[PDB]
Amino acid sequence: RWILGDKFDTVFPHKGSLKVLWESRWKFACSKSVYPFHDGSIEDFEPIFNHLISKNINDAASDEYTQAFLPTASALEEKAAQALQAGKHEEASNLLCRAAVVYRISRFPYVDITKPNSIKRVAFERQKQAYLKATSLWTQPIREVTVPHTYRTGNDGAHIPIYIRTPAGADQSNPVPIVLIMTGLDGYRPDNSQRTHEILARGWAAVVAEIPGTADCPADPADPASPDRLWDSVLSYLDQRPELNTAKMVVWGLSAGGYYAIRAAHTHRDRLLGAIAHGPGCHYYLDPEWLAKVNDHEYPFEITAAWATKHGYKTVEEFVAGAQKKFSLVETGIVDQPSCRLLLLNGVDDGVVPIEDCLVLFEHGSPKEGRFYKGLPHMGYPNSLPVSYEWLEQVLAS
């Protein structure tokens, strides 16, 4: 039934095997310093995965997995303090960035928002601490603002912690355009260094916020309307920021963030010049038939457990039974109004979220834009990244 075809009914060889996941993909991802090991080094990860392998640790949700990483990060943080003692700021940044990646992988694939005492949460707190110190040394530093959630209603929390980075010469007299990044299931505000480099290189401000049901997002994950309130608060702050031009704003939703980019393209169409949705889900990803095989594909570990919690559900059973009716942008009719310019990007053979969730969007509302990558898995990396910046330049053009 799906475009994925023969691959749909396939159990990928890494399922429930951390050994195969490392030896076949992650070892090479870490070597190349690409997702999810971007900013990391293989010297840091080689020994941790050799240890994880020796002990046949396969479940990443387990404390035994997470704790196998934290000694390395401690060692890296001390080397940084050493580097900084000798006035070596560049070495000090790079070691703390490498520390931040050890924490990132230790907390893969999801920090449970309902378990604040969890070891992955401690890992994420140590990451943010490590990263902000690393990015304090930069000429254009990443700054954390705690934005009052003035539009908070119901179960919503009080505080929206976001990362802002402004290019050299960003002034109240020459206000720069914004690219508001919306992160995903396993990637949060500290995991976007290279994107902020590229945004600043083109003379734009980088703003990074997490999505409902992840990390430090105060949005009620169980309320489909919570992201609308979330952005109402964020954009309202960016409206009050002197040097940031909200009249030239694109949102960029990655993975699970893709959903929120698509939604924002409609709900806040009058406030955005564009949206990019990278590897996005909007309807068919919540199809019971899709959910029945999603854990068997390219995701590095089981994903339904994380998805359930991220969509505000107590059990996976309840998530599988109800999620589509409640959250599908198609079923709720969100896609039936017009939208700002929306670029959809994904590999055609995505087995995390269906390519069909990009293709459906062409049958509602405003015209959509797309580039889909033959034979490529979820997000279609590396191919799908350079065209992101091509598009942004065109939309934000002077």
Automatic annotation (TrEMBL):
<keyword id="KW-0378">Hydrolase</keyword>
<protein>
    <submittedName>
        <fullName>Heptaketide hydrolyase ayg1</fullName>
    </submittedName>
</protein>
<dbReference type="GO" id="GO:0016787">
    <property type="term" value="F:hydrolase activity"/>
</dbReference>
<dbReference type="InterPro" id="IPR050261">
    <property type="entry name" value="FrsA_esterase"/>
</dbReference>
<dbReference type="InterPro" id="IPR010520">
    <property type="entry name" value="FrsA-like"/>
</dbReference>
<dbReference type="InterPro" id="IPR029058">
    <property type="entry name" value="AB_hydrolase_fold"/>
</dbReference>
<dbReference type="Pfam" id="PF06500">
    <property type="entry name" value="FrsA-like"/>
</dbReference>
